[PDB]
């Protein structure tokens, strides 16, 4: 009953590589990872992108109500820039 234990550890060294260790660390030529590996990590990796572009949206609301007219000209460096964003 040790050859029954080796055949029961090696059933758990293989599941731990199949549910977890998919993210392009398994080693086909950009087909078993371009359509087969990156579709199992699609949720919660296209969920963190959704957080990241939801902060940029929250950051344009803060660089609008506080930046007056001579603050857009310092960044973009063109006199005649704040006329395009609803002032003057």
């Amino acid at each position: 009953l040790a050859n029954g234990q080796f055949a029961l550890l090696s059933s758990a060294r293989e599941f731990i590589q199949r549910i977890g260790q998919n993210p392009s660390v398994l080693a086909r030529a950009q087909l078993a990872r371009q359509q087969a590996g990156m579709v199992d990590s699609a949720m919660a990796l296209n969920g963190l992108r959704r957080f990241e572009l939801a902060v940029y949206r929250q950051a344009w609301l803060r660089c609008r109500q506080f930046w007056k007219a001579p603050d857009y000209i310092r960044v973009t460096d063109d006199e005649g820039a704040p006329q395009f964003v609803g002032i003057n």
Partner: protein, 49 residues
């Protein structure tokens, strides 16, 4: 200090700036991640060794 929040929103009314996101949710409100799994299949490699 205690005041109305200074930051506005897209509607004009004052709101919160704090933003966040969790990975998974449960029926009763748990916020687990990814390594909530890979624990039952990983105490069976340390113990069967």
């Amino acid at each position: 200090e205690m005041s109305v929040s200074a930051y506005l929103d897209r509607n004009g009314k004052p709101t919160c700036p704090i933003e966040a996101r969790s990975c998974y949710i449960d029926r009763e409100n748990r916020r687990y991640g990814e390594v909530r799994d890979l624990r039952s299949p990983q105490d069976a490699i340390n113990k069967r060794e």
